[PDB]
Structure 1
Amino acid sequence: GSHMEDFVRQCFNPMIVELAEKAMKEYGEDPKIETNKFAATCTHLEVCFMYSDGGSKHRFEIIEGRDRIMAWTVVNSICNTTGVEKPKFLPDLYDYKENRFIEIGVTRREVHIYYLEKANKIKSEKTHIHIFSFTGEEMATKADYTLDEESRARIKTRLFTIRQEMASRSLWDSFRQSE
């Protein structure tokens, strides 16, 4: 029973905790043991939800936070309706305005390294990549940041709050030295 586990449950919203718990277990990871991965999936989920709330009403389809089968179901429906190519790997969102899938990244390292890896692994150049860091840097494909500055700023504020809350509990060092 780790301190990090109790912190995650009081730091994040209960719907977000439960969706992340079900994601871990679906893919074989235990949240009471892999507690840094527990904190990271919650964080990534919250960012995805904040992001999809950043535009107008019907702008984004949310692919993250579903079980494997339904996420791929919604992707197939988006593809066979948009004409957009079917990604090799599950993205997080679909942008009905710009007509493209989005992969959202949250990293504790310099955003450049993490984008390279997601780019290299993405294979599908099709998919737009948006990286956020816990220090306030962001980095997006073709310098196109999709949302306007204020919706991106609130995401960065929340990321820095999570980092401070961890740091006040001595969990940040273990969290950063674990990515």
Structure 2
Amino acid sequence: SAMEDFVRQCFNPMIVELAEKAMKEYGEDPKIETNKFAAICTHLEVCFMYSDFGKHRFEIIEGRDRIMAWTVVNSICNTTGVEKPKFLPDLYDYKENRFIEIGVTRREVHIYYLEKANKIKSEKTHIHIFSFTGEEMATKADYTLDEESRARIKTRLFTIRQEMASRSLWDSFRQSER
């Protein structure tokens, strides 16, 4: 199909390998679940851009194998005393000293935000939701990043959506899930 062709066109080889490993973990196949494959790449890329926009302000938990990722979280918790989250989060902010959960949605940002908040119900983990329409939503409206960084992210997301559209993959992608 053209969805896996596109993923391999637009996402750098590391991100693809990581999303393919993520899929192969629970038995999902990128050549069948092509929309989940695109979503995995996209969210991986946003996480990586987020941490790259920060002396390293952000520690990236997402994309690591569960063993390594928990090791990183447990370390952060012992040295900072921060509360240990129930679900492995996406980033750690050393400036604000808080974990972050990153969401990327094809739906309304507040729908997905409520979904994530209710999922985590840990007051300590910060939530930042991005859409493919240049919208964001974030705990207490603390967007963590400066305007240019969040614009770089919004732009890339919009660009993925528009590349899917030029290839006629957008309507399938947006009706698929989050």
TM-score of the aligned structures, taking structure 1 as reference length: 0.97
| SS of structure 2 residue aligned to 1:4 | helix
2: distance between equivalents of 1:141 and 1:19? 28
Counterpart CA distance in 2 for 1:34 and 1:156 is 25
Give the drift of 1:28: 2.1
**Offset of residue 10 of structure 1:** 0.7
- How many equivalent residue pairs? 177
- Is contact 1:92-1:101 (8 Å) kept? yes
Q: Cα distance, 1:41 vs. partner?
A: 0.5
**Residue in 2 that maps onto 1:126:** 124
Q: C-alpha separation between the residues in 2 aligned to 1:33 and 1:143?
A: 37
RMSD, matched Cα = 0.7
Structure-2 separation of matches of 1:63 and 1:33: 27
Q: Distance in 2 between matches of 1:27 and 1:152?
A: 32
Residue by residue over 1:99-148, the C-alpha shift from the partner in whole angstroms, topping out at 9 and shown as x without a partner, is 00000000000000000000001121110000000000001101100010
Q: Write out per-residue CA displacement over residues 147-173 of structure 1, whole angstroms, 9 at most, x where no aligned residue.
A: 100000010000000011000011000
CA deviation after TM superposition for structure 1 residue 27, in Å? 2.2
1:33-86 per-position Cα deviation (integer Å, ceiling 9, x unaligned): 11000000100010001111112x311100011111111111001101110000
**Higher mean C-alpha deviation, range 23-32 or range 86-95:** 23-32
Structure 2: tracts of 5 or more residues without a match = none
Structure 1 contact 110–133 (Cα < 8 Å) conserved: yes
Show structure 1 runs of 4+ deviating over 3 A: none
Asked whether the equivalents of residues 93 and 103 of structure 1 are also in contact (C-alpha less than 8 Å), the reply is yes
2-structure distance, mates of 1:112, 1:123 = 16
Instruction: Identify the residue that residue 28 of structure 1 maps to in structure 2.
Output: 27
Runs of 5+ unmatched residues, structure 1: none
| In structure 1, C-alpha distance between the alignment counterparts of 2:65 and 2:154, rounded to whole Å | 27
1 CA distance for matches of 2:47 and 2:172? 24
Contact 1:59 1:97 in 2 (8 A): yes
Task: Check the 8 A contact 1:88/1:123 in 2, yes or no.
Answer: no
User: Hey, what does 1:48 align to over in structure 2?
Assistant: 47
Per the normalisation by structure 2, the TM-score is: 0.98
Cα distance in 2 for residues equivalent to 1:145 and 1:134 = 17
Q: Tell me if structure 2 keeps the 8 A contact 1:75–1:86.
A: yes
Q: Is the 8 A contact 1:63 1:74 kept in 2?
A: yes
User: Which whole-Å CA distance do the structure 1 matches of 2:147 and 2:75 have between them?
Assistant: 31
Tell me the distance in 1 between the aligned counterparts of 2:26 and 2:73. 19
